[PDB]
C-alpha cells in the first residue's frame, strides 16, 4: 500500500 518511491530515503523493505 505504501508507495516506496514517495521518499527513497525510507527503507522500502523496513
Amino acid at each position, epitope marked *: *500500500n*505504501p*508507495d516506496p*518511491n*514517495a*521518499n*527513497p*530515503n*525510507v*527503507d522500502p523493505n*523496513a
Partner: antibody
C-alpha cells in the same frame, strides 16, 4: 556532521527563472536523495520533488513538474532546483532537505538553511 | 493526495503544563505488513528549518527530551508535551511519507502563558 548549505537570497522579475544550489557534506553524496520543499507565507510546507544523488533520477510534484527542474553534480556534492516562468506568487522560502533517512545503519533528517526568493516587478 | 489536518491551529499553556497537538490524515497510513505508521513530527522555530522529532509516529529522534512523545495510529495521531518548557515554543507540523506527493499538516502554533 551531515550538513546542507544553500545559496543566498534571490530577487527576480516575473517571467524569469531562479536556480538555488544545495551543497552537501558529511555523508556519502550518492547514497541518498535530496528533496526540495517550499514554504510560502502563511502556507503549509509543500513538497516539490526529489533527486537521487547517485543515478540522478528525479520525481516531481505534479503541482510543480511543469516548471521545476532538479539536477545534481556529484563531483561538487551539490543539488540544484530551478523554477522557471516565475510568478509573484512563487515568493517563498525554498528548502533542500535529506527528508527522513531511515535505514538499518543510518537514521536522520537534515535541512538546508532555506533560500528566500522574491518575485516582484 | 493525502491531506494532513491539525487541531488546534493554536494553543497556549502555562509553563510545565501538558500540551496536546492532534494530526488527522485523510487516508490510512498504517501498513499492516509491518504495523508502522508512515508519519513524522517536525518542530519549527522562527528563522530555522523544521526539526524532526519523531519517525514512524512514535520513535523519538536521538536527543529529543523525554517530555515529548508521539502516539496514535491509522488516521489519528497526537504529539504530547507532558511539561511545556519555555524552549518548546514553536510551530509543530505532522508529515506523511506513505504516498506521493509527500505532504505536511497546516501546523499548530504552541505558545507559553507566564
Amino acid at each position: 556532521q551531515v550538513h546542507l548549505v544553500q545559496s543566498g537570497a534571490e530577487v527576480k522579475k516575473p517571467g524569469a527563472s531562479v536556480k538555488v544550489s544545495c551543497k552537501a557534506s558529511g555523508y556519502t553524496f550518492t547514497s541518498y536523495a535530496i528533496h526540495w520543499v517550499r514554504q510560502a507565507p502563511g502556507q503549509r510546507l509543500e513538497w516539490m520533488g526529489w533527486i537521487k544523488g547517485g543515478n540522478g533520477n528525479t520525481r516531481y510534484s505534479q503541482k510543480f513538474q511543469d516548471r521545476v527542474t532538479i539536477t545534481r553534480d556529484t563531483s561538487a556534492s551539490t543539488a540544484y532546483m530551478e523554477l522557471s516562468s516565475l510568478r509573484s506568487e512563487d515568493t517563498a522560502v525554498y528548502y533542500c532537505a535529506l527528508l527522513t533517512v531511515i535505514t538499518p545503519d543510518d537514521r536522520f533528517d537534515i535541512w538546508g538553511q532555506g533560500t528566500m526568493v522574491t518575485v516582484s516587478s | 493526495d493525502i491531506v494532513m489536518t491539525q487541531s488546534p491551529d493554536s494553543l497556549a499553556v502555562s509553563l510545565g503544563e501538558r500540551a496536546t497537538i492532534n494530526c488527522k490524515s485523510s487516508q490510512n497510513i498504517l501498513y499492516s505488513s509491518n504495523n508502522k505508521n508512515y508519519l513524522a513530527w517536525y518542530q519549527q522555530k522562527p528563522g530555522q528549518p523544521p526539526k524532526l522529532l519523531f519517525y514512524w509516529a512514535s520513535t523519538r529522534e536521538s536527543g529529543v527530551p523525554d517530555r515529548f512523545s508521539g502516539s496514535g495510529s491509522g488516521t489519528d495521531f497526537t504529539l504530547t508535551i507532558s511539561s511545556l518548557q519555555a524552549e518548546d515554543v514553536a510551530v509543530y507540523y505532522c508529515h506523511q511519507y506513505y504516498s506521493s506527493p509527500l505532504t505536511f499538516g497546516g501546523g499548530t502554533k504552541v505558545e507559553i502563558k507566564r
